[PDB]
Design a protein around this ligand. Structure first.
Ligand code: CL
Ligand code: CL
Ligand code: CL
Ligand code: CL
Ligand code: CL
Ligand code: CL
Ligand code: CL
Ligand code: CL
Length: 279
């Protein structure tokens, strides 16, 4: 079948990967890219079973075969003509034997560039252009509405409570970061910027939560989890955001991703909760 070169951004620059001109049987092992390809009605025949842990993505993949993270034999059984994964995938060499494989270095694409790459893969760059323009126009208005309510210089911090540890995020690591820092243009506290610049995110020792706190503090957590321990302390209660009642929780399983489906949901939810402040 006809091929085309997909130009993958990597540490080494650009890596040309020959893929089908029109991919007919895509297996998406990296859930980051699943929503975006689905949004573009890509020919997906297998998807990481991780999508089922997001309420947003689960409803979009009900009739697609689910694949275990290391189940190479499942991937092979689906007879893919294209495989999408992360460069962290231990099995990349095995996957390349099955089909053309794009193992994304996630951090090389911001969330809009990422969806543009999905458009390039499936030959729907026009659709992405329209989606992008609509997204920028909507979130530009959202930004004005939110900054008018809270203040133009409003900063925000995203914590995630996960497996009894605390994480904080840079501007493009999901958990609402793309919407908050890029689309809405809210500020990131300097200390948090510095702590997340190199890797895009960081674990936060529990004693250091206050060092990274901004005007607004958003905690991503599981709906079925009890209150995080770090929200109980005197340190927490004395944060200006917490005193101003500018602190709220969001559903981490909804907020993990940065695909167009997740983006629509989190844009709406974040705008609602920000405009409802103070709590
Ligand atoms: Cl062909
Ligand atoms: Cl090439
Ligand atoms: Cl070739
Ligand atoms: Cl073709
Ligand atoms: Cl730290
Ligand atoms: Cl700790
Ligand atoms: Cl400790
Ligand atoms: Cl320290």
């Amino acid at each position: 079948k006809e091929t085309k070169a997909f130009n993958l951004k990597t540490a080494k620059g650009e890596e040309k990967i020959d893929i089908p001109k029109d991919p007919k049987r895509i297996v998406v092992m990296a859930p980051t890219y699943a929503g975006g390809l689905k949004y573009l009605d890509a020919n997906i025949v297998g998807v990481s079973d991780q999508v089922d842990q997001s309420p947003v993505l689960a409803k979009q993949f009900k009739d697609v075969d689910k694949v275990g993270a290391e189940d190479v034999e499942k991937v092979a059984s689906l007879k893919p003509d294209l495989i999408i994964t992360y460069n962290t995938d231990k099995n990349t060499d095995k996957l390349k034997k099955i089909a053309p494989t794009i193992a994304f270095d996630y951090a090389k694409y911001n969330y809009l560039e990422q969806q543009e790459a999905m458009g390039d893969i499936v030959g729907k760059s026009d659709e992405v252009k329209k989606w992008k323009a609509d997204w920028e126009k909507q979130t530009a208005q959202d930004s004005k509405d939110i900054k008018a309510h809270l203040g133009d210089d409003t900063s925000v911090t995203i914590f995630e409570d996960f497996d009894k540890k605390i994480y904080a995020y840079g501007k493009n690591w999901g958990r609402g970061s793309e919407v908050l820092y890029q689309a809405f243009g809210l500020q990131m506290p300097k200390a948090l910027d510095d702590a997340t610049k190199k890797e895009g995110w960081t674990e936060v020792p529990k004693e250091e939560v206050g060092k990274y706190a901004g005007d607004v503090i958003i905690t991503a957590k599981a709906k079925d989890a009890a209150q995080p321990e770090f929200q109980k302390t005197a340190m927490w209660q004395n944060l200006e955001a917490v005193q101003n009642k500018y602190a709220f929780n969001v559903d981490s399983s909804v907020y993990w991703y940065n695909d167009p489906y997740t983006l629509d949901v989190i844009r709406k939810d974040l705008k609602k909760q920000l405009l409802a402040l103070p709590t």
